Amino acid sequence: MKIGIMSDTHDHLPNIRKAIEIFNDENVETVIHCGDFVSLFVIKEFENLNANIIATYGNNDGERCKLKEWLKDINEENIIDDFISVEIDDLKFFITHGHHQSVLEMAIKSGLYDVVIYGHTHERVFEEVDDVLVINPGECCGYLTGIPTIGILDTEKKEYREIVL
């Protein structure tokens, strides 16, 4: 009962690859990428991942439909949209790329969700506000801050772990 969380890979193959290895060596049923995968060729790299993918689009994602199509070739279970609202291990998740805070806030204050993954490069966090777990793993590529990171959430224990790549 462990979920991988990543975002902002920005075509950084070596780090994308380390992330996948880390998610495989761990249980990890599903992996969430709120990301700016950025380029289509990155999706290929995800064939080596032994888990389904719940993705969301960032501002820099150009080939939107091709990204969707390719993620589904990897597995029909995989999904991707601007916003994703799903339930996992009996938990209500809201997932999106960290664009406007106004959507983050309604999401938290609406009370409709147990977890809000608001992925983006800055403002890395794992906090609880109004009983809603708020998580942002930060950039997987580590280009703007110099610190590459991903995260793993144990849905069962409601505990999170930031992993510096």
Curated annotation (Swiss-Prot):
Activity regulation, short description: Competitively inhibited by phosphate.
Binding site for Mn(2+) 2: 36, 59, 97, 120
Disulfide bond residue pairs: none
Entry binding sites for Ni(2+) 1: 8, 10, 36, 122
EC number annotated for this UniProt entry: 3.1.4.-
Cofactor comment text: Binds 2 divalent metal ions per subunit. Most effective are nickel and manganese.
pH-activity profile: Optimum pH is 9.4-9.8.
Residues noted as binding Mn(2+) 1 in the record, renumbered to the chain: 8, 10, 36, 122
Keyword Hydrolase: yes
Similarity comment: Belongs to the metallophosphoesterase superfamily. YfcE family.
Complex and partners: Monomer.
Function: Shows phosphodiesterase activity. Hydrolyzes phosphodiesters bonds in the artificial chromogenic substrates bis-p-nitrophenyl phosphate (bis-pNPP), and less efficiently thymidine 5'-monophosphate p-nitrophenyl ester (pNP-TMP) and p-nitrophenylphosphorylcholine (pNPPC). No catalytic activity was found toward cAMP or cGMP, nucleotides or phospholipase substrates such as phosphatidylcholine. The physiological substrate is unknown.
Protein name according to UniProt: Phosphodiesterase MJ0936
